[PDB]
Amino acid sequence: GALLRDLVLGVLGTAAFLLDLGTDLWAAVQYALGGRYLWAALVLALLGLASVALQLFSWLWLRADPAGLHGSQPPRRCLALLHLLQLGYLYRCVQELRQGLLVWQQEEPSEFDLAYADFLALDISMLRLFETFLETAPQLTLVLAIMLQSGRAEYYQWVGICTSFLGISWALLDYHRALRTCLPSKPLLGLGSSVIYFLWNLLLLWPRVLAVALFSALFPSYVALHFLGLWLVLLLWVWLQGTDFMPDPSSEWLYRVTVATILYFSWFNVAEGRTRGRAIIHFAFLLSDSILLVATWVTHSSWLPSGIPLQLWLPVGCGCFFLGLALRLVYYHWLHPSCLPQNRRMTHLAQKFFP
Amino acid sequence: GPPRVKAVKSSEHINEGETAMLVCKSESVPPVTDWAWYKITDSEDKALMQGSESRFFVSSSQGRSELHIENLNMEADPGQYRCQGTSSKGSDQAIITLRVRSHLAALWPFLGIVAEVLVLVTIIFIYEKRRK
Amino acid sequence: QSVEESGGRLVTPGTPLTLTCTVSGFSLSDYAMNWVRQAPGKGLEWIGIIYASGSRYYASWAKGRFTISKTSTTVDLKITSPTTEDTATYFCARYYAGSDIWGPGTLVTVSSASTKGPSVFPLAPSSGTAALGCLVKDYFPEPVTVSWNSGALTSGVHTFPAVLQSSGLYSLSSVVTVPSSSLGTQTYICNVNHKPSNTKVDKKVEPKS
Amino acid sequence: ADVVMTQTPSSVSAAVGGTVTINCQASQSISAYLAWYQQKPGQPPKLLIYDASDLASGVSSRFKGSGSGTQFTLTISALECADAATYYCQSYYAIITYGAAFGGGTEVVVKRTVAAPSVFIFPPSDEQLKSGTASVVCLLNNFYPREAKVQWKVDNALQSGNSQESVTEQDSKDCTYSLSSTLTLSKADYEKHKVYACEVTHQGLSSPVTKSFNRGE
Ligand SMILES: CCCCC/C=C\C/C=C/CCCCCCCC(=O)OC[C@H](COP(=O)([O-])OCC[N+](C)(C)C)OC(=O)CCCCCCC/C=C/C/C=C/CCCCC
């Protein structure tokens, strides 16, 4: 069942990421040929910077990797023309697909090949997490901001937000799958831990996206300052923290960049295992900023066209917030545990996540 | 018969630096020929003459009068204004309240944000540098 | 309560021009007057306003390019330096609450070309309802009015909007549908009038054998 | 600084009896002094709503203005064919400082039932050839929808660049359109060829209709 589970889950992942890119692109095209181009330019640049940062992640990790990945037909040059062409994250996917398929089809290969496959699926999982909080999350905030600001919601945008949502759902499920599969799973329902992980994290993730959106639509000229400021502080926090996630020390610039940007939307432990203190500090940041933002909306109330019902979505915000908080408590209290190519990044992160 | 005048907006809230336009209207027959605006003060009501301080303007038509106040001041402009229309059969009055929002409340998400950033930096800088 | 503009015509760039709006049914001392312009096939541009007291306020983009004044019965709008980008229809409107009473509007064209009279050619009816019309071609500048049988034929009259040609002259057709039986026992004459060239032409459109 | 009005959408359609909405967004607080106007092609505009909610004199109740602050919205119901026109909003809040700029405009197109176009062609009259020019007119009458393609064929050759189209506004009685196509040619090129046709393609036509005539005959 392991082989089937792997291949089908990975198919799901690849398809999801595809669909999400497709919808985003379609939306952008619609914008440009539909009217104003500033929204097309913003989605293009957001896409670009995201893609480029995942591209430099994958290229860094490849450069570090010891003697392995021998089934790499392009000898150091095509890999680079590929990554340099902004088209990437696809080679890792196809590689996972082809490996898993070759294994499934083979009767019973060596315990080395299987480990290589597990490492491939762990890598892809990681890069999906990073893809989701670097690309789909901002893209979702942007789309919500345009819907609420212009006031005219169309089919493309509804589908882009059901896609974004599906991408965050897959992403966080795959990342809980990975985090638990890297260490001995003492409990018996790791799928139930994964599901309540998706529920908690997304339940509180959404209100922050709505908040940022609301802001972005009430003051589109202050988003740059706001995000740059908070990101400066988060970055600084990571710098004051420790970072030994990937071999290259000089290259930690990217890891701290991403950690900075992921904290802006959720809670991602950096490198220590001292809980119940940095959690409350986070939650007080995220909450205070979201409350301030909502407050800015309730101040500049009559400032947006009567489009999406705002006297129905906002209550759902506090409801999802409260619920998320509850299941987060339930996750830490109840499910949260106490304590051959091998991914040293995922061993790292797993041990630093389960102290 | 007697005229009946009413404000378009009984209460308004504009901000300093801009120009408020209060307007009264009436539909009685005969129409209101002359209109007069007064500002309410403690125990006395002062008439608003056109051209005062190069910032007041009155534009009157049959049964309708606009009061334009430029460069909304926080000290003398906010308050209650009374419009009085005098038709050949009598006169009537309406009351309009004007508030002036300042830049303190306008630049509320700027000070708020920079204060929150300052607080965050202090919290993290004491929680790690010396406490941790 | 009405107003009527006058002074629209063709002028060369740089030559000043004064438009006059004559009110009727109300005094200019008890109501304000707005001046609004509209380019061919575009939206309305607000130019300026003159209050009852006499104060004049102009739009930001129009500061200096225009001048508003008024007498006891008319409001005048002078253009000091018209440009090619100043060709538009100009309306005057009484300001009470927005602009309720509007004028018919006068057309001001600014170009280097000269006026040219219109040429009218009959569209003979084909051979249970026949169509026929008049082709108003190679005229300048706008506008031209077309009426059928001194204004007695209105049902079915379609006047197509003019279009600019390569030579720089406008052209349009005015067609009308009538019963085929009537072509033999009824005279159809189109009356084209082009005020800028003072050209009145009444052309009959007879059927072809 | 003059207040700028952002009128959206540019176009809006509905069937006879439906309901349309138009939104105007002001650059600054013009809380309740916004007027709505209906301008028909050729005729001058007519004031529809003042103070953003008060109906003008002699105006039907189908027009309803709502909104305040910086967002306003006009709504029409029971859309008759006489409603086909362009609508504009206009701010008049403290004109002496921000002006009275107008909106971009909103062409309201009524969506009636499909109507096939009656096609007639008119050769240039003998009097016009004296001047030295020939103009052929292809008339599409009382049709719907507005989208239609006119093609000029001279001696089976497809012409392009020597013709001009013109489309009228929606009729106030039956919501139909009219279109004229004026092929322009010199005397020489007109006498050179023999057969002239006007291939008209439209949704209301189940098959391409080709009206043609012969020179002289
Ligand atoms: C190398 C440096 C890297 C870090 C910095 C670079 C990238 C990230 C920064 C993003 C911020 C971009 C903000 C754009 C500002 C300019 C907007 C503009 O000029 O006009 C926007 C337009 C205005 O429209 P209007 O005039 O009708 O407004 C009328 C307004 N009133 C109603 C009041 C009259 O409205 C709109 O489009 C509103 C849409 C706004 C969408 C904002 C999305 C923000 C997302 C943030 C997440 C970022 C992730 C980056 C990845 C991290 C990598 C390290």
PDB file of C-alpha atoms and ligand atoms in Angstrom, chain A residues 36 38-39 42 46 49-50 53 134 138 141-142 145-146 149 212 216-224 227-228 231 257-258 261 264-265 303-304, chain D residues 25-27 71, ligand 1:
ATOM      1  CA  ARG A  36      -6.187  47.745 -16.179  1.00  0.00           C
ATOM      2  CA  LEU A  38      -1.361  47.120 -12.979  1.00  0.00           C
ATOM      3  CA  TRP A  39      -3.007  44.000 -11.561  1.00  0.00           C
ATOM      4  CA  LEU A  42       1.609  42.787  -9.870  1.00  0.00           C
ATOM      5  CA  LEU A  46       4.735  38.180  -7.479  1.00  0.00           C
ATOM      6  CA  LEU A  49       9.902  36.511  -7.399  1.00  0.00           C
ATOM      7  CA  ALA A  50       8.242  33.428  -5.886  1.00  0.00           C
ATOM      8  CA  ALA A  53      13.181  31.957  -4.945  1.00  0.00           C
ATOM      9  CA  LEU A 134       5.723  32.141  -0.885  1.00  0.00           C
ATOM     10  CA  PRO A 138       0.443  36.235  -1.428  1.00  0.00           C
ATOM     11  CA  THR A 141      -4.243  38.002  -0.586  1.00  0.00           C
ATOM     12  CA  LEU A 142      -3.813  39.917  -3.848  1.00  0.00           C
ATOM     13  CA  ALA A 145      -7.795  42.582  -2.442  1.00  0.00           C
ATOM     14  CA  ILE A 146      -8.777  43.079  -6.076  1.00  0.00           C
ATOM     15  CA  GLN A 149     -11.555  46.749  -4.088  1.00  0.00           C
ATOM     16  CA  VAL A 212      -4.040  41.731   4.757  1.00  0.00           C
ATOM     17  CA  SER A 216      -4.533  46.112   0.650  1.00  0.00           C
ATOM     18  CA  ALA A 217      -7.948  47.254  -0.577  1.00  0.00           C
ATOM     19  CA  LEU A 218      -8.407  50.143   1.863  1.00  0.00           C
ATOM     20  CA  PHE A 219      -4.881  51.550   1.368  1.00  0.00           C
ATOM     21  CA  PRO A 220      -3.037  50.066  -1.623  1.00  0.00           C
ATOM     22  CA  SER A 221      -0.134  52.512  -1.165  1.00  0.00           C
ATOM     23  CA  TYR A 222       0.688  51.391   2.401  1.00  0.00           C
ATOM     24  CA  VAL A 223       1.052  47.644   1.731  1.00  0.00           C
ATOM     25  CA  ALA A 224       4.663  48.037   0.600  1.00  0.00           C
ATOM     26  CA  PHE A 227       5.030  44.340   4.613  1.00  0.00           C
ATOM     27  CA  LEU A 228       8.586  45.655   4.270  1.00  0.00           C
ATOM     28  CA  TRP A 231       9.433  41.597   7.142  1.00  0.00           C
ATOM     29  CA  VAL A 257      14.150  35.331   3.774  1.00  0.00           C
ATOM     30  CA  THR A 258      11.567  32.574   3.511  1.00  0.00           C
ATOM     31  CA  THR A 261       7.894  35.719   4.976  1.00  0.00           C
ATOM     32  CA  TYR A 264       3.978  36.832   8.374  1.00  0.00           C
ATOM     33  CA  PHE A 265       1.094  34.420   7.679  1.00  0.00           C
ATOM     34  CA  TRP A 303     -14.754  53.348   1.247  1.00  0.00           C
ATOM     35  CA  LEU A 304     -15.347  50.258  -0.967  1.00  0.00           C
TER      36      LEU A 304
ATOM     37  CA  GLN D  25     -16.249  56.033  -7.135  1.00  0.00           C
ATOM     38  CA  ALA D  26     -15.056  59.504  -6.149  1.00  0.00           C
ATOM     39  CA  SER D  27     -11.445  60.416  -5.449  1.00  0.00           C
ATOM     40  CA  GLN D  71     -19.296  55.157  -3.449  1.00  0.00           C
TER      41      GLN D  71
HETATM   42  C1  LIG E   1      13.409  42.847  -3.483  1.00  0.00           C
HETATM   43  C2  LIG E   1      12.405  43.295  -2.447  1.00  0.00           C
HETATM   44  C3  LIG E   1      11.444  42.214  -2.018  1.00  0.00           C
HETATM   45  C4  LIG E   1      10.377  42.685  -1.045  1.00  0.00           C
HETATM   46  C5  LIG E   1       9.451  43.714  -1.612  1.00  0.00           C
HETATM   47  C6  LIG E   1       8.871  43.311  -2.931  1.00  0.00           C
HETATM   48  C7  LIG E   1       7.789  42.581  -3.126  1.00  0.00           C
HETATM   49  C8  LIG E   1       6.651  42.424  -2.166  1.00  0.00           C
HETATM   50  C9  LIG E   1       5.848  43.677  -1.996  1.00  0.00           C
HETATM   51  C10 LIG E   1       4.571  43.826  -2.299  1.00  0.00           C
HETATM   52  C11 LIG E   1       3.771  45.074  -2.088  1.00  0.00           C
HETATM   53  C12 LIG E   1       3.205  45.640  -3.354  1.00  0.00           C
HETATM   54  C13 LIG E   1       2.241  46.801  -3.146  1.00  0.00           C
HETATM   55  C14 LIG E   1       2.006  47.646  -4.374  1.00  0.00           C
HETATM   56  C15 LIG E   1       1.974  49.132  -4.101  1.00  0.00           C
HETATM   57  C16 LIG E   1       1.568  49.990  -5.290  1.00  0.00           C
HETATM   58  C17 LIG E   1       0.103  49.914  -5.593  1.00  0.00           C
HETATM   59  C18 LIG E   1      -0.348  50.922  -6.624  1.00  0.00           C
HETATM   60  O1  LIG E   1       0.364  51.774  -7.087  1.00  0.00           O
HETATM   61  O2  LIG E   1      -1.624  50.772  -6.984  1.00  0.00           O
HETATM   62  C19 LIG E   1      -2.323  49.598  -6.511  1.00  0.00           C
HETATM   63  C20 LIG E   1      -3.774  49.671  -6.934  1.00  0.00           C
HETATM   64  C21 LIG E   1      -4.413  51.018  -6.686  1.00  0.00           C
HETATM   65  O3  LIG E   1      -5.686  51.070  -7.385  1.00  0.00           O
HETATM   66  P1  LIG E   1      -6.587  52.395  -7.283  1.00  0.00           P
HETATM   67  O4  LIG E   1      -5.771  53.557  -7.778  1.00  0.00           O
HETATM   68  O5  LIG E   1      -7.925  52.096  -7.901  1.00  0.00           O
HETATM   69  O6  LIG E   1      -6.792  52.573  -5.701  1.00  0.00           O
HETATM   70  C22 LIG E   1      -7.727  53.573  -5.212  1.00  0.00           C
HETATM   71  C23 LIG E   1      -7.491  53.791  -3.738  1.00  0.00           C
HETATM   72  N1  LIG E   1      -8.545  54.598  -3.005  1.00  0.00           N
HETATM   73  C24 LIG E   1      -9.798  53.806  -2.887  1.00  0.00           C
HETATM   74  C25 LIG E   1      -8.058  54.941  -1.641  1.00  0.00           C
HETATM   75  C26 LIG E   1      -8.833  55.855  -3.746  1.00  0.00           C
HETATM   76  O7  LIG E   1      -4.495  48.641  -6.204  1.00  0.00           O
HETATM   77  C27 LIG E   1      -4.016  47.389  -6.263  1.00  0.00           C
HETATM   78  O8  LIG E   1      -3.671  46.877  -7.294  1.00  0.00           O
HETATM   79  C28 LIG E   1      -3.971  46.707  -4.930  1.00  0.00           C
HETATM   80  C29 LIG E   1      -3.324  45.360  -4.978  1.00  0.00           C
HETATM   81  C30 LIG E   1      -2.245  45.213  -3.924  1.00  0.00           C
HETATM   82  C31 LIG E   1      -1.719  43.812  -3.737  1.00  0.00           C
HETATM   83  C32 LIG E   1      -0.729  43.698  -2.606  1.00  0.00           C
HETATM   84  C33 LIG E   1      -0.209  42.294  -2.339  1.00  0.00           C
HETATM   85  C34 LIG E   1       0.816  42.248  -1.252  1.00  0.00           C
HETATM   86  C35 LIG E   1       1.395  40.891  -1.010  1.00  0.00           C
HETATM   87  C36 LIG E   1       2.364  40.666  -0.142  1.00  0.00           C
HETATM   88  C37 LIG E   1       3.085  39.373   0.056  1.00  0.00           C
HETATM   89  C38 LIG E   1       4.490  39.456  -0.445  1.00  0.00           C
HETATM   90  C39 LIG E   1       5.273  38.439  -0.741  1.00  0.00           C
HETATM   91  C40 LIG E   1       6.598  38.587  -1.419  1.00  0.00           C
HETATM   92  C41 LIG E   1       7.419  37.339  -1.405  1.00  0.00           C
HETATM   93  C42 LIG E   1       8.594  37.412  -0.448  1.00  0.00           C
HETATM   94  C43 LIG E   1       9.941  37.314  -1.110  1.00  0.00           C
HETATM   95  C44 LIG E   1      11.080  37.675  -0.191  1.00  0.00           C
END
